[PDB]
Scaffold this active site. Structure first.
Site, PDB file in Angstrom:
ATOM      1  N   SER A 128       0.842  -1.198   0.000  1.00  0.00           N
ATOM      2  CA  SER A 128       0.000   0.000   0.000  1.00  0.00           C
ATOM      3  C   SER A 128       0.886   1.261   0.000  1.00  0.00           C
ATOM      4  CB  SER A 128      -0.932   0.035   1.182  1.00  0.00           C
ATOM      5  OG  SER A 128      -1.641   1.278   1.207  1.00  0.00           O
ATOM      6  N   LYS A 129       0.859   2.003  -1.108  1.00  0.00           N
ATOM      7  CA  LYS A 129       1.644   3.243  -1.239  1.00  0.00           C
ATOM      8  C   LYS A 129       1.389   4.235  -0.116  1.00  0.00           C
ATOM      9  CE  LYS A 129       0.650   4.170  -5.893  1.00  0.00           C
ATOM     10  NZ  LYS A 129      -0.206   3.904  -7.060  1.00  0.00           N
ATOM     11  N   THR A 130       0.090   4.563   0.097  1.00  0.00           N
ATOM     12  CA  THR A 130      -0.356   5.510   1.109  1.00  0.00           C
ATOM     13  C   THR A 130      -0.217   4.926   2.515  1.00  0.00           C
ATOM     14  OG1 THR A 130      -2.722   4.886   0.973  1.00  0.00           O
ATOM     15  CG2 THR A 130      -1.961   6.700  -0.439  1.00  0.00           C
ATOM     16  N   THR A 189      -4.831   2.816   2.662  1.00  0.00           N
ATOM     17  CA  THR A 189      -5.859   2.077   1.930  1.00  0.00           C
ATOM     18  C   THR A 189      -6.784   1.267   2.865  1.00  0.00           C
ATOM     19  OG1 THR A 189      -4.127   1.700   0.346  1.00  0.00           O
ATOM     20  CG2 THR A 189      -6.159   0.500  -0.042  1.00  0.00           C
ATOM     21  N   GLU A 216      -9.206  -1.283   2.906  1.00  0.00           N
ATOM     22  CA  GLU A 216      -9.245  -2.737   2.969  1.00  0.00           C
ATOM     23  C   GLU A 216      -7.888  -3.302   3.359  1.00  0.00           C
ATOM     24  OE1 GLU A 216     -10.284  -1.565  -0.383  1.00  0.00           O
ATOM     25  OE2 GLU A 216     -12.224  -2.485  -0.731  1.00  0.00           O
ATOM     26  N   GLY A 260      -0.820   1.159 -10.303  1.00  0.00           N
ATOM     27  CA  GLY A 260      -0.991  -0.127  -9.666  1.00  0.00           C
ATOM     28  C   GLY A 260      -0.930  -1.329 -10.614  1.00  0.00           C
ATOM     29  N   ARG A 261      -1.603  -1.228 -11.781  1.00  0.00           N
ATOM     30  CA  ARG A 261      -1.763  -2.331 -12.727  1.00  0.00           C
ATOM     31  C   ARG A 261      -0.536  -2.451 -13.610  1.00  0.00           C
ATOM     32  NH1 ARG A 261      -5.222   1.833 -13.670  1.00  0.00           N
ATOM     33  NH2 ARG A 261      -4.933   2.993 -15.619  1.00  0.00           N
ATOM     34  N   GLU A 279      -9.019  -1.850 -16.684  1.00  0.00           N
ATOM     35  CA  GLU A 279      -8.819  -0.679 -15.841  1.00  0.00           C
ATOM     36  C   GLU A 279      -8.109   0.418 -16.640  1.00  0.00           C
ATOM     37  OE1 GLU A 279      -6.395  -0.776 -12.225  1.00  0.00           O
ATOM     38  OE2 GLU A 279      -8.256  -0.285 -11.187  1.00  0.00           O
ATOM     39  N   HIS A 318     -13.260 -27.759 -22.903  1.00  0.00           N
ATOM     40  CA  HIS A 318     -14.329 -28.640 -22.438  1.00  0.00           C
ATOM     41  C   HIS A 318     -15.557 -27.829 -22.072  1.00  0.00           C
ATOM     42  CE1 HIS A 318     -10.974 -31.380 -22.709  1.00  0.00           C
ATOM     43  NE2 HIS A 318     -11.951 -32.296 -22.757  1.00  0.00           N
ATOM     44  N   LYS A 333     -16.276   3.943  -3.718  1.00  0.00           N
ATOM     45  CA  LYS A 333     -15.520   4.046  -2.467  1.00  0.00           C
ATOM     46  C   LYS A 333     -16.253   4.996  -1.515  1.00  0.00           C
ATOM     47  CE  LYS A 333     -10.764   2.796  -3.798  1.00  0.00           C
ATOM     48  NZ  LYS A 333      -9.511   3.304  -4.416  1.00  0.00           N
TER      49      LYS A 333
HETATM   50  O1  PA5 Z   1     -19.351 -30.370 -20.673  1.00  0.00           O
HETATM   51  C1  PA5 Z   1     -18.859 -31.412 -21.179  1.00  0.00           C
HETATM   52  O2  PA5 Z   1     -19.474 -32.289 -21.785  1.00  0.00           O
HETATM   53  C2  PA5 Z   1     -17.349 -31.610 -21.060  1.00  0.00           C
HETATM   54  O3  PA5 Z   1     -16.749 -30.573 -20.314  1.00  0.00           O
HETATM   55  C3  PA5 Z   1     -17.066 -32.909 -20.352  1.00  0.00           C
HETATM   56  O4  PA5 Z   1     -17.584 -32.779 -19.019  1.00  0.00           O
HETATM   57  C4  PA5 Z   1     -15.564 -33.258 -20.427  1.00  0.00           C
HETATM   58  O5  PA5 Z   1     -15.189 -33.375 -21.799  1.00  0.00           O
HETATM   59  C5  PA5 Z   1     -15.266 -34.561 -19.735  1.00  0.00           C
HETATM   60  O6  PA5 Z   1     -16.016 -35.649 -20.393  1.00  0.00           O
HETATM   61  P1  PA5 Z   1     -16.116 -37.014 -19.536  1.00  0.00           P
HETATM   62  O7  PA5 Z   1     -16.800 -36.687 -18.226  1.00  0.00           O
HETATM   63  O8  PA5 Z   1     -16.911 -37.949 -20.454  1.00  0.00           O
HETATM   64  O9  PA5 Z   1     -14.687 -37.464 -19.324  1.00  0.00           O
END
Ligand code: PA5
Ligand code: A1IIB
Ligand code: A1IIB
Ligand code: CL
Ligand code: CL
Lengths: 551, 551
Positions: free
Chosen positions: A215-217, A220, A222, A277-278, A363, A394, A516
């Site tokens: 925190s610089k100041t 802050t 939080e 900051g960022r 930001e 997936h 804030k």
């Molecule tokens: O949403 C989905 O279908 C996928 O994310 C599956 O859950 C993921 O491919 C894993 O498949 P499985 O549970 O048959 O291993």
């Protein structure tokens, strides 16, 4: 006005790009572009060479871009004076116009000790002196010479901070965790929610825990609340305030506050107002990284940023890699009307990289007012999101492949794993997904192929893929400290380019203030017993329902 | 031809909503709405009562909505047959048309043992019998009757799985961590990246580690590879494969493939085809949750979902909380053109709640083809993102306040913390932020107020806030297992409502299915030494650069 133009829409190339969008861009076929141009991959990929002779390939060739479009975007960047603003940044000029400050995170990683002045006074030694202090301190933690109040080496280091004082240290310690030392762990308390303190400190030993209050100041709300709670936890065991000095250090400017807290002033690590900051993980704020992976690794990380800085400063726009990425963002944001930007590391260490980039990007560039002090009536910063692959495949990649929204995406892979287990089997699998996913987003799958694959009747359309969905592929050799430094600076300078074209100030953040101030008002009301009627009916309703339900 | 219409845009109310958007929606003033309607908070907030008499307030009153708009949206939902599709879901009908499957996550949490048939056979007892197995096994891990191969209690449970077989277990174990037991920890390997295996297993003891291999199909490449590597790690220490039966169990629909992998059928926890992965945490897939927090807590979580299911099933649309949320989503997505949906829990335990929802939402509704097997001419699924607050406030709320993008947001707070440290000081601070951020987004700060607060000349616009930025606030008493089960089901049923309106199949995922068959071609090419030219020039260029840079 220091600004050379008022609105991006005033620049002549803007309307020309609108007309190119209509004629060529909206219906752009990436498939056709590769068919037309055998040298397309060569023309739209660039190899970046880092200071250590390592390399990173930036492949933009699956984007909705060709020579004509990219040349127009480069003309727009010239009309916007990107290079002038960049040069003013590196000159130490006060390009943060609303706070009247320099913008000089590039000076933090000036390991070459170039002359880099603010207000006509070089910064190179003052920066380097803090880094030397960081090396000393971090070395003493790592080698056991700094002991806790019962004479033990430190085992755990807890950073307490919010925003840029937390997310950089988190992301970079996660990303470079292969470079850590068994038996020296880091932790990060950031949320004011007391869960964050309770769960973080639960299994730690006060005798062997060291805190860094970031925190610089040093005022802050939080962060100082968290810091005070941690000090109470420490003192519950240590039972004497004289022990604080062996267990608490500050990443701050405010010596009176630090010393008041019980911290020796010798253990304050400063940084200047011209560090946002960022953009601060390169500063004293990075101390937890130096402790976790060693100063020399942290220094290599700085040197990777420095090398990318030098690329950004010295390369003509048409071959300038962060510029090209910023130009492509503008193309999708302002001409296609894509509101988001996806970043997917095919790298589990980099699991917090998209969250880090979210702060850096949003930001900086979530602004509605230009450097000429007029309102934009065009889009500015995008919404940046992501998760690592292969997990992302997936899940929300369903929508990336078959939804109705254009989602520009950046995929990042290292050719070499820090963990090449099982004779590199996992790594060859990971890599295959990287190449296959971008390939699939481009090539798609037409009706004829769906039929050939055995679908008939109404099922067929459900299995089609449009393709022509853009990706940028970034292949590194290995995610070393140096590589990661260059990759963050790439996004810093991409973010710079975007903001320069939009003519916004990427370096202020006035947008935090209203919430804030309003929180302070409400906090007093939550301390008091009565029902509240001082706000709108929703705010009153919510407060009053809370009061009925709280402990 | 099971569908009652082809395209949402051709529902008669759709064009009426476009006209309302132009006349009243686009320029809607929330401030004026409150001033016009002294009962607005009461009219646009609903209390949900859970099965245990706990409560959650759903306040929608800061949205860009009034009675006229919401009544039109309800009419749209009736024209779309939302109720008829939902009733078919709850009847076990095969509403997943493209896979010809029931959609019956609701049957997983049927603790009441209502008749819930698939293919005309009640599922209630079959589901319940798996839950009894789960209770037996999780109890035996927790009480030490299930020992490892050297007679020790299990200390560490590693789930191995990806996507729907990973993210629920991750999120819910994190969210309900207050209900865990010292000395019994959970871990989650999912990414194929070998880092995920190496780092997770680095400090675990094979003698006291139990693996749950979680895979619906039990054929997913990442998971089976990861599971094989984990078995190798186990056998490195344990030597004798007879010991596997104490250390590996399976969560799956495919008994033949489990047994083929070397797992005993007695250690398989089954589920059915009608559980989609992103709706699966309620099934056998949730076993890590039952082990971590105890089966009774897990059962309470199920019962929370069941209570929200009953709300969804039995409530007229105009008062049906998940439907109202889904109607607002359609309003913003399809009439305002907002591409994103932000979810921010003011709760650190819930830090993985946005990522989980991202999967549920985007994988369900990222589709371009309707139930009438034609392509849409309108937007479908939104891009869902977020992080917990207060971290999110100090990351990207700058852009939420002062950027150029409409970002519908859901904020979530518990009135009572599991960790009310320092006499609830943290909790009051956290709550103050929850109320103030939604207040701020609504009220803004005009030019006159910025000048009154001291800004002059060109600085003034930079400090303005538009306000009229919408939020939904969700206030729970406490994030118990039951509350969390209700919250997830809320978002499941919101997702259902969106998809029903858009006339898409929210329950298939032909992009994620493609993904799982994409990488194998290239994988064979990475096994071979030679350069490749079998793809587009980009994919070839990336593979060939990789080959030059790899181990
Ligand atoms: O949403 C989905 O279908 C996928 O994310 C599956 O859950 C993921 O491919 C894993 O498949 P499985 O549970 O048959 O291993
Ligand atoms: C500044 O915050 C505090 O006063 C504090 C008091 N107890 C914990 N924190
Ligand atoms: C199924 O994956 C494997 O063959 C494997 C081999 N070694 C670890 N995993
Ligand atoms: Cl625009
Ligand atoms: Cl109104």
């Amino acid at each position: 006005s220091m600004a050379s133009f008022k609105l991006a829409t005033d620049l002549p190339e803007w309307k020309k790009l609108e007309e190119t969008y209509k004629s060529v861009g909206e219906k752009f076929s990436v498939r056709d572009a590769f068919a037309k141009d055998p040298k397309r991959f060569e023309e739209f990929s660039w190899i970046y060479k880092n200071y250590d002779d390592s390399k990173i390939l930036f492949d933009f060739s699956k984007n909705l871009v060709n020579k004509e479009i990219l040349d127009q975007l480069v003309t727009l960047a010239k009309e916007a004076g990107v290079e002038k603003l960049r040069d003013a940044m590196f000159a130490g000029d006060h390009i943060n116009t609303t706070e009247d400050r320099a913008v000089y995170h590039v000076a933090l990683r000036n390991r070459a000790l170039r002359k880099m002045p603010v207000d006509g006074k070089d910064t190179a030694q003052e920066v380097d002196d803090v880094l030397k202090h960081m090396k000393e301190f971090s070395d003493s933690i790592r080698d056991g010479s700094w002991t806790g109040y019962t004479g033990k080496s430190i085992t755990d280091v807890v950073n307490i901070g919010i925003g840029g004082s937390d997310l950089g240290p988190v992301m970079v310690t996660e990303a470079l965790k292969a470079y850590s030392k068994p038996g020296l762990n880091v932790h990060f308390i950031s949320n004011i929610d007391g869960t964050h303190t309770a769960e973080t400190l639960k299994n730690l030993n006060p005798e062997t825990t060291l805190f860094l209050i970031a925190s610089k100041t040093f005022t802050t709300a939080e962060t100082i609340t968290n810091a005070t709670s941690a000090k109470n936890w420490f003192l519950a065991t240590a039972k004497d305030s004289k022990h604080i000095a062996k267990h608490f250090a500050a990443l701050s400017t405010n010596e009176k506050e630090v010393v008041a807290f019980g911290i020796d002033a010798k253990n304050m690590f400063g940084f200047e107002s011209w560090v946002g900051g960022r953009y601060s993980v390169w500063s004293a704020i990075g101390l937890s990284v130096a402790i976790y992976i060693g100063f020399e690794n942290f220094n290599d990380f700085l040197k990777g940023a420095e090398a990318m800085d030098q690329h950004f400063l010295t390369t003509p726009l048409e071959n300038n890699i962060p510029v090209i990425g910023g130009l492509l963002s503008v193309w999708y944001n302002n001409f296609f009307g894509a509101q988001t930007h996806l970043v997917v590391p095919f790298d589990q260490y980099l699991h917090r990289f998209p969250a880090y980039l979210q702060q850096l990007s949003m930001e900086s560039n979530g602004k509605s007012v230009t450097r000429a002090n007029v309102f934009t009536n065009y889009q500015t910063g995008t919404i940046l999101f992501g998760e690592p692959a292969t997990n992302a495949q997936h899940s929300f990649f369903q929508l990336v492949h078959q939804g109705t929204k254009l989602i520009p995406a950046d995929f990042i892979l290292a050719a070499q794993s820090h963990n090449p287990i099982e004779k590199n089997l996992h790594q060859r699998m990971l890599a295959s997904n990287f190449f296959a996913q971008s390939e699939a987003l481009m090539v798609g799958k037409d009706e004829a192929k769906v039929k050939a694959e055995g679908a008939t009747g109404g099922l067929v359309p459900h299995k089609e893929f449009s393709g022509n969905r853009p990706t940028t592929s970034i292949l590194a050799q290995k995610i070393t400290p140096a590589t990661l430094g260059s990759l963050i600076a790439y996004y810093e300078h991409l973010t710079f380019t975007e903001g320069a074209i939009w003519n916004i100030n990427s370096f202020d953040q006035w947008g935090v203030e209203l919430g804030k101030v309003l929180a302070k008002v409400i906090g007093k009301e939550l301390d008091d017993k009565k029902a509240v009627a001082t706000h709108d009916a929703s705010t009153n309703g919510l407060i009053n329902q809370f009061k009925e339900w709280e402990e």
